[PDB]
Amino acid sequence: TAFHTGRLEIFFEPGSIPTVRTADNLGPDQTQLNGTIAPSDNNYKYIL
């Protein structure tokens, strides 16, 4: 709705990924994506 509001960051980082692993599948790692590790300040990004 129009009342829903906020800001969002999209930031692109080449290369590998901080991942979690399984014997059947993989997954992403959120911990390595906190604003302190990957600030996303200079990297290519958009803010919606």
Q: Which residues in this chain contact another protein in the complex, by CB under 8 A? A: 1, 3-9, 12-15, 24, 37-44, 46-47
C-beta of 9 vs 20, nearer to another protein? 9
CB of 36 to another protein, least distance (A): 10
CB of 26 to another protein, least distance (A): 14
For 36, the token pair is: 């302190």
C-beta of 7 vs 21, nearer to another protein? 7
Computed over its alpha carbons, how large is the radius of gyration of the chain?
14
Give the Å distances, CA to CA, from 19 to 27, 29, 33, 35, 38.
Answer: 6, 5, 11, 17, 15
